[PDB]
Amino acid sequence: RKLFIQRAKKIDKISRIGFPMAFLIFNMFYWIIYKI
Amino acid sequence: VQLQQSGAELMKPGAAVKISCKATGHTISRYWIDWLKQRPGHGLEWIGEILPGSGSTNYNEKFKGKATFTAEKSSNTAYMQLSSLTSEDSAVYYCAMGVRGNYFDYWGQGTTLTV
């Protein structure tokens, strides 16, 4: 129900905070390698 | 650049031995590989030369047919197969190499041939 909808909110609330982090942790790991 | 040969060879008269010159440091098909014979009592002596990529060889007139040069790009090595082995072939067989001229500036450790 509406409580089941809360997973539909956290399914995006996790991405909204974790998805851009997954690109920042990649961005640190990309330049450290190819700068050598 | 280095040239690694094989161990000594004790061959019976009339047989044929094949000596190897393992080129560890450069592609074998790059430079001319030379072969020299040093029997004691006498001095050194130039057997011939082979380019291990083009199959070209230049044998000394005294060693025509006596020695036969080959090569193998899969292992980077040039072979010299001596046929009709006699007691006269008891000497040391080097595989020299001259990069900037006909001199010999890169040598192998030497392979004794006891017959």
Binding site: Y34, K35 | R100, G101, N102
Partner: protein, 64 residues
């Protein structure tokens, strides 16, 4: 050895220089536009470091 295309310059005169010293020492300067070929390694493309070479080789004379 890897020239891949080359041409003298012949604008208003052959761009050649000759200077023979008193003991025979010859100088020889010619202007050449080359399109040499260097095999590039693009393993890390935007941040690579190339090494392009030119080889001044003789053709019809051996090293003796």
């Amino acid at each position: 050895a890897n020239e891949k295309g080359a041409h003298f310059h012949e604008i208003t005169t052959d761009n050649k220089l000759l200077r023979i010293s008193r003991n025979g020492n010859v100088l020889y300067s010619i202007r050449i536009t080359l399109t040499l070929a260097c095999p590039m390694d693009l393993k890390n493309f935007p941040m690579d470091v190339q090494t392009c070479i030119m080889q001044l080789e003789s053709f019809g004379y051996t090293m003796n």
